[PDB]
Amino acid sequence: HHWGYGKHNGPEHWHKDFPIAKGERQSPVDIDTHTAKYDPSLKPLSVSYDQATSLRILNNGHAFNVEFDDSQDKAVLKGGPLDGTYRLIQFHFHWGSLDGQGSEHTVDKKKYAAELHLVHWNTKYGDFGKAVQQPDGLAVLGIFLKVGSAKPGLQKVVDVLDSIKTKGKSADFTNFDPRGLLPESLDYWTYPGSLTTPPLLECVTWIVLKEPISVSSEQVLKFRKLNFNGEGEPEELMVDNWRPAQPLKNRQIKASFK
Ligand SMILES: NS(=O)(=O)c1ccc(C(=O)NCC(F)(F)C(F)(F)C(F)(F)F)cc1
């Protein structure tokens, strides 16, 4: 015990150990599509993942992270609302117990079945642990998942999950190409926010794609067989590992598209 997504340690409790939970730039948020203003000054995002080197996949008890080699500028995010260069460190998802919930951001109050976060850190701060202490330290690219046709590029991820069922298990996961998780369009909303799990640091530029990717029911069913618990402990399925939308407060969500 410590924080989680159970009845007794879930999002509504996190503020007790992490008072920033009630802060001024918390994530996720609802994206009201009528209120987000088109900003003709935003650039097209530059997602440069040709040289991405995945290493390992880890069940950390709250989700699973696909980890990359971020010792050099291989897979980077630039442009859009960003100044400078952000290195990909990991991706993970948040998902529901059923298809009608799971995403952290919402769009006109609609919840998607899951949400992918591609986490990047600003190289001008030298390492990730320094970057999370800065208001422009991270850029997280958020992509919604809806259930329909299978996503071919997700299958390698789904097929390794049986080997990392429980908290603390990892497996080698080399040569995975995250370009296969992108939608066709890179149109996005952006706003300043936070990590969505404790310690909830207010260090993130959020970039949320408008176009969801489609994954199959079978694919997401396999995410739902993972466990929050460690090996041999009472089984708690890893489902509903999402934080609900937080107050927007004094923030503007900008759209890259008209
Ligand atoms: N879901 S999210 O918003 O994309 C998202 C992305 C990344 C983290 C994350 O690195 N937490 C871990 C951490 F950074 F807080 C940390 F413990 F490593 C430290 F020490 F603070 F640096 C959390 C949420």
Ligand SMILES: [Zn+2]
């Ligand atoms: Zn996340």
